[PDB]
Structure formats: structure tokens, C-alpha cells
Subunit: 189 residues, 2 copies
Amino acid sequence: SNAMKDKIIDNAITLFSEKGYDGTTLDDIAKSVNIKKASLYYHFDSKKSIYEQSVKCCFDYLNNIIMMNQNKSNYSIDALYQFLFEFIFDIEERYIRMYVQLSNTPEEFSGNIYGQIQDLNQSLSKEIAKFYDESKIKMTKEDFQNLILLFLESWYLKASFSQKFGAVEESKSQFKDEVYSLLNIFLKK
Amino acid sequence: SNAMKDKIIDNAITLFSEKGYDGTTLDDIAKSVNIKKASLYYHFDSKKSIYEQSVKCCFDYLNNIIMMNQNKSNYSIDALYQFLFEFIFDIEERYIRMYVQLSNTPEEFSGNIYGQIQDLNQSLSKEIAKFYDESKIKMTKEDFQNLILLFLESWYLKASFSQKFGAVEESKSQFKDEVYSLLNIFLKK
Ligand SMILES: [Cl-]
Ligand SMILES: [Cl-]
Ligand SMILES: [Cl-]
């Protein structure tokens, strides 16, 4: 136990991350905690409400990776890799897989979800900015932020794909080569 | 009928790109072309065959962007900006969304799909390399290919999200200006 509401939402994040909104059924969710479909209604009013709550949990998790980066980082150029690794290859891969699946959200209520996406981007940009050192980096702090953000954005899909298709070690190796190359691009010699 | 089979696939790409495999029904597909559902089986033996063939068509389309560029491009710096423009603006949204939807394919049908994902990346990288010019790009060829690849591969998820959350054309314009701003950093030209 002890909280059926949380059990449904934990199971739902998994189902949604694997099949997306349109492909995940209330029956799937109910089966996954061993209750009848109608018993979901003890905890939620709709499928859309189960999804919204699962999406909030997903953003809570991702935002927390960022917030926690300051207990783990001296913000040197060398610490930047560790940060980008932890965000793309987090112990629990369903969260990034879920973020990619947001692209299947009911266009109905994408406004709140869109806000969460912008908020997460703001927070990620702010964390990247702490690694900026004008004397070491041959571009503005804004261009450095945009570059690293796009680097991470290309990897969300690439990491989801490699997880889904069981090529994760090969993917981490490519990422390591690409971050090396990224540092080479922006570091003054 | 080869023409009907083609029309079924063309429509199924659209439907799949919207709701993915599990969220798309054979009924949906038949209605799209206004045929009885039994008529689907004249050309396919299952929903699985329609999807496989739709995914292949989608990669043919995406790979054809490169073939077209080979046919025309002088590979100048001007041609590099135009290729980036064409990738962002001229790739029809449904093919990008189909590509992102490859994320919720049932495991039982992984097929050759990851191979197609990796080959497209390989092919794009080879075409990008043709624009490298030591006299104009203040980069190693390695870093130039990686930079251009991150522009193109970050576009997939942005474009897929733009459909749900705001505006496809506004996103193209904003992303194009962003990518141009970053590329400009590396041009001696
Ligand atoms: Cl209950
Ligand atoms: Cl990348
Ligand atoms: Cl424009």
C-alpha cells in the first residue's frame, strides 16, 4: 500500500510513456492495479484527469533532477558533462520517454502542459547558465544556453529510441563522443 | 488495387502520425478512404502490415529530402542555409510526427525500425559533410557535422510538439532564426 491514488498514477506514467494518451485505455490502467474500471472513479473523475496528474508527476521528477544538480556540481566546464548525462540518462528512463509522449496530449488541454514545458525549459536554461564562463567560452551566454538546450533536445528522442530498441550502451557511447565535440566547439583554446 | 493500396498507406500515415499505432483503428483507416473495412484486407492482412508499410513510406519521404538536395545543391554556404531552411519549413508535419510516433510502436513489432532511424541519421550526416569547407567554417569537420545534426535532430521534437502546443509555422520561423544565429558564429565565409 498504502495509497491507491498514487499506485494508479505510478502505473499510469508507465502505460502513458509506452503507448501515449490515445493508446492507453482506462482498462489498461485498471488492470495494472487489479481493480475494476469503475473503481478508478474512486480516485479520479476521468482518463484526462489521470493523465494530467501523471504529467505533473513527470515534470516534478524532471524539475527535481535540475534542482538537485547544485548538491552535486562545482559548475566547472568539467561538471557540465555529468549534468547533461544525468538529465538524458536518468536512472528512471520512463520520465524522458513520457516527456516525448507529451506530443500526443489531447490538443484539448495543451495549455497547461505547454506552460510546464516552458517552465522546465526556463529552469534548464538557468542551470546551464551557471556553467557559463565568459573568459573560457567563445560565444555569448545566450548562445551557449541555446546551443546546450538544442543539444539536449536532440537527445530526448535519441535516448528514448535507444531505450525502446535496447541499444542503450551504444547510445551512451555516442553521447559521450558528442559532448566531447560540444565542449570543443564552444571552449576557447 | 495498387492505387488503393497507395491511398490507404498515405491516409494511414496521417492517422498514425496523429494517434500512433494503438490509438489508430482499422475502422479509422477505412473511413479515411471511404471503403468498407473488409476492403482493407484486399490489400493488407492486418493493422500491423499497414503500419509497417506506412513507416517505410515515411522513411522513403524523409530520405528523399537528401536525394533532392544532391540533385540541385552546389554545396556552398548559401546552399547550406537553404538546406537548413528546407529541412525546417518543407518537411511536411505528418512525417515528422510519424517519426516521433515510432516511440509507441508495440514491442512485438519493433521490426527494422531502429535500423531505419539510424540509417536516416547516417545519411543526413554524410550529406551534411559535403557542405564542409575548410576556408569558410571555423570548425573541424567532426564538429561541423555534429552541430548541423543537432539542429536537424532537435527539430523533430519541436515540430511534433508545435502541432499540439501553439503554431507549426511560427515554430519553423523561430527555430530557423535560432539555428541561423548559432551557425553564423562559425562562419569566416
Ligand atoms: Cl479505491
Ligand atoms: Cl545530437
Ligand atoms: Cl521566416
